[PDB]
Amino acid sequence: KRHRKVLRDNIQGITKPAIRRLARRGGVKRISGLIYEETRGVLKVFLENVIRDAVTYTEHAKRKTVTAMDVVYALKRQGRTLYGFGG
Amino acid sequence: DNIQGITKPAIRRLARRGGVKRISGLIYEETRGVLKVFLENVIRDAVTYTEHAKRKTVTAMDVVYALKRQGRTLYGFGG
Amino acid sequence: PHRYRPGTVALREIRRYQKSTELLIRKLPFQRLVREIAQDFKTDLRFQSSAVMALQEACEAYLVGLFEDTNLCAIHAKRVTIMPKDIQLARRIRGERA
Amino acid sequence: PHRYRPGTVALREIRRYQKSTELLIRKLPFQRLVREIAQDFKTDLRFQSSAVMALQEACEAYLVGLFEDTNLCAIHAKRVTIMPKDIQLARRIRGERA
Amino acid sequence: KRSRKESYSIYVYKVLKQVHPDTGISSKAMGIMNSFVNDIFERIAGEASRLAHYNKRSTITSREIQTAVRLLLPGELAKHAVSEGTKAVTKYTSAK
Amino acid sequence: KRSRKESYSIYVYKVLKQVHPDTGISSKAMGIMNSFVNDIFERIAGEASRLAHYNKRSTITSREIQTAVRLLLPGELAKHAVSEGTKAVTKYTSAK
DNA sequence: CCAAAAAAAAAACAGCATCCCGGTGCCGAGGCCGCTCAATTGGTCGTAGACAGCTCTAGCACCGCTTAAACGCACGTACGCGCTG
DNA sequence: CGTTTTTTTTTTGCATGTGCCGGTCTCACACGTGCCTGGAGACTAGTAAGCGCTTCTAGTGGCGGTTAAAACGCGGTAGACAGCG
Incomplete structure (x- = not known):
């Protein structure tokens, strides 16, 4: 059927101070402006590519709920394997 | 001792297919140590397949699996 | 009034956050962003709370690794300021970027 | 008394060598450097000339590929002359070395 | 004599x-x-x-072949493949 | 009750x-x-x-578990992993 | 010598934030229990792979000749590199 | 103001690469045989999973408040970047 919620544009929810903290951990001392919407470009392509794969896993398993474990079979498939969520 | 056999004019020609115009002379040195490291890795594993078949002749199919191991798949010899 | 030099608090922030391991994206925006994207493939999907944490661990790390790769390309063009041209580069060698 | 300008032949060699597909390392000096290293893991070894060929293909191809990235890292440094620090960087990012 | 090496030639x-x-x-x-x-x-x-x-x-x-072909092949390469596979299977079972 | 999740912990x-x-x-x-x-x-x-x-x-x-453990592990973990693997095999074949 | 002066430096004072402390609180580590199922024991049966034998492919050795390629040097141009605004 | 310039267009002559006409040669694609083993077929056998029913986990959504993080602006330090030798 259908219910409350249809989409939105949370892309701008990546506060500048959020991307800045990633880069501060990534050893970065100085950050251009053009940076923060550049990162919004990549981070968006990342998840699209993981979640495509994770959604492909859920659809095989004929669920409607994406698990932690669906994300992991994809993340590994995309050579970025994660320890701390089973598998 | 045979390392050099990979000549300075040979490296030049690789880089020219690599889309290089101007090459520091420091690079010909560098390239050898890289190329050596690549063949070590690939050879080592490729023999490891030979010594497990118990042959003493290394085969095309031993290199193909060892490159495929290293991420380097090689279409053309067996496969 | 007191005033540190540009760069000074940037150093302390590095040391402060390199030390810790806690997520530096706000988990809510993220979730909405994960949901928003999830919809594009198929709408009305439920997500385990571990699944949105699974992605938020995967993404935040990947990017911290990208900013390491990126900060070198910048120092490698003799600069300190990271730039678009550095993340483009990093990704290109990496082969994430044709 | 004719001479070409430092670069305009390199570019002719580039143009030419990409267009072609023959092995740009001499076949014996390689076949020895196959044998030489191979004796360090086990002595008394043979090689199918095809499996020599296999290694030349993959090693030439590898370096071709690496020169492209090293070229890109040296352009990125406001240069056309590639250097060792441009190999060092393109491997570091490639995740071959640390 | 020889080996008996199967190709796809x-x-x-x-x-x-x-x-x-x-x-x-x-x-x-x-x-x-x-x-x-x-x-x-x-x-x-x-x-x-x-x-x-x-x-x-x-x-x-x-169904597991299909779901591999989805993950593996990117965009428009997958699509044409899924269809050639789907058609191939439907055309098989329906034939005899 | 909840059904089982087998783990190495x-x-x-x-x-x-x-x-x-x-x-x-x-x-x-x-x-x-x-x-x-x-x-x-x-x-x-x-x-x-x-x-x-x-x-x-x-x-x-x-022997396959060995030929493998060489290829995959680095030099000084491989040596030691090959050690413990030969040890456990000789102690089982004797102890049995 | 005794100036610059400006630059370059040293430290002296002052200020800000992080580190490590005990004083406090709770929840997740860690363990114990009781039970189910998955690992073990024992026995049987079928074949995987070891072994010996033989065939013969192809990998190694060498040789002498014909260049194609490597080497080497020379000259100067264009590009790496520093310094500065 | 009309003198030295660089130096920016203009033939100017020049050298390779790309053929498009020739022409000759060789060995690898291409195709043909002959036989052998791997897929076809029909029957049997057992259980994987498809289906319907139930349990009850855990995923959603909404509140209301506290105050931590997002935002925005100002100011000037310092780093990017161009120029030039």
């Missing part, structure tokens, strides 16, 4: 006799085309396997 | 008390150390599978 000659049927092929290329078949073979059968194995299944069906 | 507690007695662990960490063994299992078992398949053999012995 007769099948690649017919798919060549079906697309660019004038142009022939060098033996170095035929070993490459051969190596190509066996790689995606190994990739799909490999992903199809792990799907079944994550979903507690003792059988790989049409 | 009882062995990891023992092996923890072996190596550092009075050192504890967190749930998450134990979840990590879980993942670790699975990955490795899948790696090792995986290469070994190929070794059988490549040499026209049906059964994986510890």
Whole structure:
């Protein structure tokens, strides 16, 4: 059927101070402006590519709920394997 | 001792297919140590397949699996 | 009034956050962003709370690794300021970027 | 008394060598450097000339590929002359070395 | 005598006799085309396997092949493949 | 009741008390150390599978588990991993 | 010598934030229990792979001749590199 | 103001690469045989999973408040970047 919620544009929810903290951990001392919407470009392509794969896993398993474990079979498939969520 | 056999004019020609115009002379040195490291890795594993078949002749199919191991798949010899 | 030099608090922030391991994206925006994207493939999907944490661990790390790769390309063009041209580069060698 | 300008032949060699597909390392000096290293893991070894060929293909191809990235890292440094620090960087990012 | 080495060469000659049927092929290329078949073979059968194995299944069906072809092949390459596979299967069962 | 989730974490507690007695662990960490063994299992078992398949053999012995553990692990972990693996095999074949 | 002066430096004082402390609180580590199922024991049966034998492919050795390629040097141009605004 | 310039267009002559006409040669694609093993077929056998029913986990959504993080602007330090030798 259908219910409350249809989409939105949370892309701008990546506060500048959020991307800045990633880069501060990534050893970065100085950050251009053009940076923060550049990162919004990549981070968006990342998840699209993981979640495509994770959604492909859920659809095989004929669920409607994406698990932690669906994300992991994809993340590994995309050579970025994660320890701390089973598998 | 045979390392050099990979000549300075040979490296030049690789880089020219690599889309290089101007090459520091420091690079010909560098390239050898890289190329050596690549063949070590690939050879080592490729023999490891030979010594497990118990042959003493290394085969095309031993290199193909060892490159495929290293991420380097090689279409053309067996496969 | 007191005033540190540009760069000074940037150093302390590095040391402060390199030390810790806690997520530096706000988990809510993220979730909405994960949901928003999830919809594009198929709408009305439920997500385990571990699944949105699974992605938020995967993404935040990947990017911290990208900013390491990126900060070198910048120092490698003799600069300190990271730039678009550095993340483009990093990704290109990496082969994430044709 | 004719001479070409430092670069305009390199570019002719580039143009030419990409267009072609023959092995740009001499076949014996390689076949020895196959044998030489191979004796360090086990002595008394043979090689199918095809499996020599296999290694030349993959090693030439590898370096071709690496020169492209090293070229890109040296352009990125406001240069056309590639250097060792441009190999060092393109491997570091490639995740071959640390 | 010899080994008895199975290739795909007769099948690649017919798919060549079906697309660019004038142009022939060098033996170095035929070993490459051969190596190509066996790689995606190994990739799909490999992903199809792990799907079944994550979903507690003792059988790989049409459906696990498909779901491999989705993940593996990007955008428009997947699409045409899924359809050629779907058509191939529907056209098979319905034939006899 | 809840149905079963088989994990390696009882062995990891023992092996923890072996190596550092009075050192504890967190749930998450134990979840990590879980993942670790699975990955490795899948790696090792995986290469070994190929070794059988490549040499026209049906059964994986510890010789395949060795030829594998060399290829996959680095030099000084491989040496030691090959050690402990020969030790456990000679002590079982004698003790039995 | 005794100036610059400006630059370059040293430290002296002053200020800000992080580190490590005990004082406090709770929840997740860690363990114990009781039970189910998965690992073991024992026995049987079928074949995987080891072994010996033989065939013969192809990998190794060498040789002498014909260049194609490597080497080497020379000259100067264009590009790496520093310094500065 | 009309003198030295660089130096920016203009033939100017020049050298390779790309053929498009020739022409000759060789070995690898191409195709043909002959036989052998791997897929076809029909029957049997057992259980994987597809289906319907139930349990009850855990995923959603909404509140209301506290105050931590997002935002925005100002100011000037310092780093990017161009120029030039």
